[PDB]
Amino acid sequence: DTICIGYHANNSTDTVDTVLEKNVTVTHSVNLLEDSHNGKLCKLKGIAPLQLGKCNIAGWLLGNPECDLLLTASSWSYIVETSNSENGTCYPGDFIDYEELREQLSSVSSFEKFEIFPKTSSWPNHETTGVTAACSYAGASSFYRNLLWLTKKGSSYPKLSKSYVNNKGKEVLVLWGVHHPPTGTDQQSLYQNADAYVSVGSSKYNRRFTPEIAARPKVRDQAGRMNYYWTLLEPGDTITFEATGNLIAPWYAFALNRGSGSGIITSDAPVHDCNTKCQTPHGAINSSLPFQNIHPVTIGECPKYVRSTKLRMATGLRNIP
Amino acid sequence: DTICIGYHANNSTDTVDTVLEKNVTVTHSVNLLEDSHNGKLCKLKGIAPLQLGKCNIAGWLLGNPECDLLLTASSWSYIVETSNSENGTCYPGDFIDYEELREQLSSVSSFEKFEIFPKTSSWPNHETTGVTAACSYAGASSFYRNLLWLTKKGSSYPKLSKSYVNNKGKEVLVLWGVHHPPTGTDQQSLYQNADAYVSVGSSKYNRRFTPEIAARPKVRDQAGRMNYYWTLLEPGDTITFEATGNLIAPWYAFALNRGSGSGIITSDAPVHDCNTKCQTPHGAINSSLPFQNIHPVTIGECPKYVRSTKLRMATGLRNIP
Amino acid sequence: DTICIGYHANNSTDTVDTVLEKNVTVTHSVNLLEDSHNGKLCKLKGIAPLQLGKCNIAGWLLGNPECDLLLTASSWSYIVETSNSENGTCYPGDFIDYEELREQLSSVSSFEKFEIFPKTSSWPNHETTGVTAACSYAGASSFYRNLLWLTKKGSSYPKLSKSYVNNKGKEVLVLWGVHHPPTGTDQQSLYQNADAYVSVGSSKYNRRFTPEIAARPKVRDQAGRMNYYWTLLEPGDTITFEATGNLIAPWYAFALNRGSGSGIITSDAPVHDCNTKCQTPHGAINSSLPFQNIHPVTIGECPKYVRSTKLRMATGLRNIP
Amino acid sequence: GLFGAIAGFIEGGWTGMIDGWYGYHHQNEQGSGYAADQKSTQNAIDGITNKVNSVIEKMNTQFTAVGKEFNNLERRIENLNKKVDDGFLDIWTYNAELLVLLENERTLDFHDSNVRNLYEKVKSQLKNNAKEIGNGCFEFYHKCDDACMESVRNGTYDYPKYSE
Amino acid sequence: GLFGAIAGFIEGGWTGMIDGWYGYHHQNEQGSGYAADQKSTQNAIDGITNKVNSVIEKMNTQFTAVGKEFNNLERRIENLNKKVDDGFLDIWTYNAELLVLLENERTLDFHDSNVRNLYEKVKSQLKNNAKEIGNGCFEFYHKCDDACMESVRNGTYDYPKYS
Amino acid sequence: GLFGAIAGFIEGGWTGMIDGWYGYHHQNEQGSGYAADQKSTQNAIDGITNKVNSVIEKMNTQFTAVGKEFNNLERRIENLNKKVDDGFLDIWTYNAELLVLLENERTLDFHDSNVRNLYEKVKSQLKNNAKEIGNGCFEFYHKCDDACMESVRNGTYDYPKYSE
């Protein structure tokens, strides 16, 4: 009569590496490395990302006429741009502190557009009709929907002064622009004043802009330039615009409550109603495991990115059938 | 007759965690995690911090009148601000590269204030007496102690030119300001010259300022603004001020030798004569152990901050009484 | 008759540390720590670094007369400056975004200098002969080799307009300057026009510069200043210069394909024809081992820098002869 | 193996034993079969489960947006940002690889230890009432029925019952 | 335990043995009592002390001010700075936790190994001059007085004398 | 040592055995001498070689220029960059130091384990045909020539060839 001491074996083909030996076959093992994704852009924190259609963030904020797609959410957990986000600033120039703004707008809990300076009643002493072929809609010269091009009325551009008080109970993002004619002749033809300036001020913000007149190459067939500026106006504060020329005035602005800690994903992966805690440009991933090799640039609560193709932990023992 | 082999047990209730088993009771153990602090702000490198009291760094440097009782040393190893540091720039405006200045002053060795442009002899043809309700002391209109508000003497503001050569054998920090009236009438009333400018220059620093006259919301009941500027003048170098108006002139400046690698602590904890190698806003901590859970923000040679509530190392063995 | 079980011993004096015991003598061991270097600056990616001789990057780009070792390779993998690189901007002033430019030039391919605005044919209506004692060569007053000082011809400085189209099929780095005389008399003597301006424009660049006439300390005996500017002109783009005065015009420019991910080393170590994968300011090191104590600031594929003086791994066993 | 049992003096494992990691094969007049040792198997399972859970659960994950955008005059801080990401990448890849290599070895050592401890426990109770061949087997010097064989597996084996 | 002694074939510890980690309990005609084994105990102490000091002393840092201040147009570098601080926190927290878990296991193994080694040394000395009970105890086949019991603890036990 | 063989019940090593880490010393009428055990030696070499290569090769490196230049209005980001470099330094120094300390302990344990396993393997095949002296030696109860002891080292030793 005999009794023997022994250990389990099975049909497992699972292999792991050990410090002493490569590719050891074991009876049981577990994966520590998330190597797969769902190929989709999902909701983060139960909230969908902002989708801008044909436009980038600048075109959307300024109201590029090709952004007339009216459906933007009132809130978002991050922002998606694609290979199709082509419509930006249609009138050429610099968007100042653009990256800072994109970062600061990457998540919001409430967002609303409103008319800050109504076109019809705000500017009795100036011409509001300015358009440009550089921003066209339906084959006709047009302009940004959220800005207004002010020019001289009947050979006069008097000093303008316009103030807005923020009663919205949240931040107001105010955008404007400053136009830079290519020549001094164009300056006078538009604004009448060679010495023109733009002043913008609030309790926190103070800045003065003057036209920089230079012979320049045509961009989108425009020798002129427009620089774009913005500030976040606090609840209760006032913002005041003064100009003797060159002001591209706010028409519409945005009231919002900023979130924090989000960003922008650039991906052509399709947006879906799925939920995730971790989003990658390739698609969403499961966040339960400690490590992932899908992508280093992620948004969410995410496993740590590693270059590893395999991290597999032995649980059972050496399989010796 | 018998002899037995065995091991120690005792009354120890000490527990540790192991990879295979939680909460193992052991006979002896040691703590790897510094979990306590002394509730004091102490000396680093044998030198006490700068305490600014009611004032922040801006108020201290400019000489906000509420700062006048601040007793400052010739050296400090770091700077403490408190929840009570409210007295800054009392006349509203921007302090340019403020965070940079704060960083660069966080530790210094030989710090002295001196009169760079004596008030009595530097300005025979300009008024030096300008004050404002915005910087008030004991209920009376006043001004920064280290700057002078220069205005016109008898309807004229002649072009001023003043130079200082740094013979101090160390860096000199020079601060000044530029005033921006709310109206052209104020401009003329103060400086007479609508065409006024301020130019500051040295071997390194070269900058020109012109008044920005615009309607702005009142801050501390001022529609006007003063922007504040600074530069570190190297030994042997010269700085030159020219102005036809709007200059808030240096009166006092600072000679110093900057240290490096320190910072600002924001804490309401009391400063004491104790010594530490690691300082936190909650208090000083022992730097002997490798890890600390007291505070993520430290100054010194410090244990690494961890989220752990317990790191306890077994020394003795399993306690089995 | 006997058989015994035993283990190897030898004459090895090799020691290693263990968690339980220091300085254990073992029969065999291997070094994990690269502690030596070859005292040479070598080629990275099979390409020698740029060596600037007596000059720093600014002096090289502008053509400081004391450089005049004008021959550069068409490519380099990094840049070396030495304790002897003293010759920069010889005429005092500001070099805008200098660090960014140095970074962008740290590695390049297809690099070539070319004459963008030939001195002989480009300026029929202006004098090109301007020199200065501040930039001297062979004991005579001179000027930057890559710029031209344009001054009035026979009491007149007409408005100039000059354009360059980049047909080189790669980026063109264009450098220029703007001169700021110390007096209005100097302004008139040089350029005839008190109202002078310089304008520069391209698809991305837009600026109008105005002379700032002010009292300044003399640097290299110059009360005047020249500010230096640059832009990377994209393939196909045009850059246009207009001036009524004060233009220090481009003469020579550079065409290049910028590389990425490299940097600048400051070292007096001699450059040699050797190859390395890791360069330190002290010299090249073998990159085979995981750790090095030679230097934290490196360029290449480098072992991780550590403070360790010894990392030695036991391979054989405890040596007990 | 470190403890010399698995792929050791016990040459191979048992596909015949489905219900546990460690156990017994018995042979007597009543027949033969496999039985898992429930105590040692479960103790190992608890231990290994705790190891796996520690590696997974000790990882702190907070909401983070890794990405950053820079303009063309921001190259220096853009590369600073890259050095940060790449540096964390180097650290986590290296540490994760070696943690898994080192702990897999320890896990296989652990199983080896458990088999050895089980073998020696059985050896201790049987004493000279059985012969030690090798390959993990004991030949009894008496007849051991299913009740006796159970006492061996239960650790209740009665030595001076069978000293005969 | 890995070496099968502590909580092993030796089921429990001795509160009665105050003066060391490892040792002996003897019983003879003259009486009974506890004695710590000084060599194995002190060697274990030296080893564990080196381990603790290694974990502590290998940590070396330089003077650093962690805090940074950024304005409202500096959000990106502010978040970069945060990514750095938080990344260091994740790495050190994870590594500290696991280092302690793993090394505590090794320390307990070490004690277990030491007890087993002591047991096997005595077994090796006594041979068939004593019987193995299984609780870590040896019953002599001769009489062992305090001088004899001391020789076992000292490693000087004379086998051919009591054969 | 953890397994109690090296500097253990086998007190010292053999300068006389050049050709391997672990092995045998034999003495019979034909003479005496040392022989390395090739199976255990080569297995150890493969294992240790794999460990060293793991520590070296798991390190991943990309081309990096560590240095950055900042002007005198960039002090904050200059110190941020320094905090990154210094932070990586603290992490790699600490981890490299402890990895080497800990894995050297494991390497020496591994050798200890290998000697013990070799010893116990020889013990099992010889059984009572030999006497266990201590210090790792066996005294045969029969005469073992170079051909016989080779079978012991070969693991092919024939027990019921010999008796008494």
Ligand SMILES: CC(=O)N[C@@H]1[C@@H](O)[C@H](O[C@@H]2O[C@H](CO[C@]3(C(=O)O)C[C@H](O)[C@@H](NC(C)=O)[C@H]([C@H](O)[C@H](O)CO)O3)[C@H](O)[C@H](O)[C@H]2O)[C@@H](CO)O[C@H]1O
């Ligand atoms: C001030 C002015 O009208 N100047 C004339 C130049 O614009 C013109 O050069 C041609 O201009 C073309 C663009 O014409 C628009 C446009 O952008 O669509 C016409 C718009 O009505 C006008 N908008 C307003 C509010 O005035 C707009 C504007 O003048 C500029 O954008 C200001 O920079 O110009 C196009 O760019 C052609 O390529 C260009 O040659 C010249 C030649 O006719 O005459 C100028 O008087």
Ligand SMILES: CC(=O)N[C@@H]1[C@@H](O)[C@H](O[C@@H]2O[C@H](CO[C@]3(C(=O)O)C[C@H](O)[C@@H](NC(C)=O)[C@H]([C@H](O)[C@H](O)CO)O3)[C@H](O)[C@H](O)[C@H]2O)[C@@H](CO)O[C@H]1O
């Ligand atoms: C130049 C002048 O006196 N202008 C008068 C306006 O100041 C005044 O508007 C009121 O001004 C109030 C503040 O008055 C002070 C102050 O800051 O306390 C008075 C100071 O003496 C004066 N300082 C100097 C050197 O002249 C200072 C200064 O004018 C301004 O700071 C310049 O920007 O003003 C306060 O802001 C009130 O809210 C405001 O209505 C108007 C109306 O009475 O009269 C102007 O003559």
Ligand SMILES: CC(=O)N[C@@H]1[C@@H](O)[C@H](O[C@@H]2O[C@H](CO[C@]3(C(=O)O)C[C@H](O)[C@@H](NC(C)=O)[C@H]([C@H](O)[C@H](O)CO)O3)[C@H](O)[C@H](O)[C@H]2O)[C@@H](CO)O[C@H]1O
């Ligand atoms: C326009 C002119 O000639 N102005 C005279 C001043 O330059 C001169 O002040 C002295 O100038 C000294 C430097 O002289 C140069 C120079 O940099 O070497 C002479 C150069 O030929 C001239 N360059 C050109 C293109 O004309 C250059 C230039 O004027 C300045 O760089 C303009 O900023 O000046 C030196 O700086 C002395 O320290 C300074 O006193 C005064 C008095 O001699 O006469 C002016 O007519």
Ligand SMILES: *[C@@H]1O[C@H](CO)[C@@H](O[C@@H]2O[C@H](CO)[C@@H](O[C@@H]3O[C@H](CO)[C@@H](O)[C@H](O)[C@@H]3O)[C@H](O)[C@H]2NC(C)=O)[C@H](O)[C@H]1NC(C)=O
């Ligand atoms: C919105 O974005 C679209 C791009 O998807 C713009 O549409 C068209 O873009 C192409 C270039 O991709 C333009 O081509 C140009 O064609 C002219 C000849 O007409 C040529 O001379 C130029 O060199 C250039 O290649 C095209 O003109 C442009 N269409 C229009 C109507 O301008 C569109 O312009 C963008 N709209 C806005 C409001 O931003």
Ligand SMILES: *[C@@H]1O[C@H](CO)[C@@H](O[C@@H]2O[C@H](CO)[C@@H](O)[C@H](O)[C@H]2NC(C)=O)[C@H](O)[C@H]1NC(C)=O
């Ligand atoms: C090139 O750099 C050298 C630095 O060595 C400059 O030489 C200095 O020139 C000043 C001004 O003439 C003298 O006062 C110093 O004595 C010189 N120093 C030395 C060490 O010789 C030189 O001026 C620079 N030249 C250019 C064109 O930049």
Ligand SMILES: *[C@@H]1O[C@H](CO)[C@@H](O)[C@H](O)[C@H]1NC(C)=O
């Ligand atoms: C995440 O969800 C569960 C839990 O980890 C897992 O089974 C699943 O495979 C993961 N998702 C994907 C897409 O792999």
Ligand SMILES: *[C@@H]1O[C@H](CO)[C@@H](O)[C@H](O)[C@H]1NC(C)=O
């Ligand atoms: C690095 O040094 C040389 C290169 O000259 C190389 O052969 C060697 O293998 C490397 N060092 C080690 C310890 O392998």
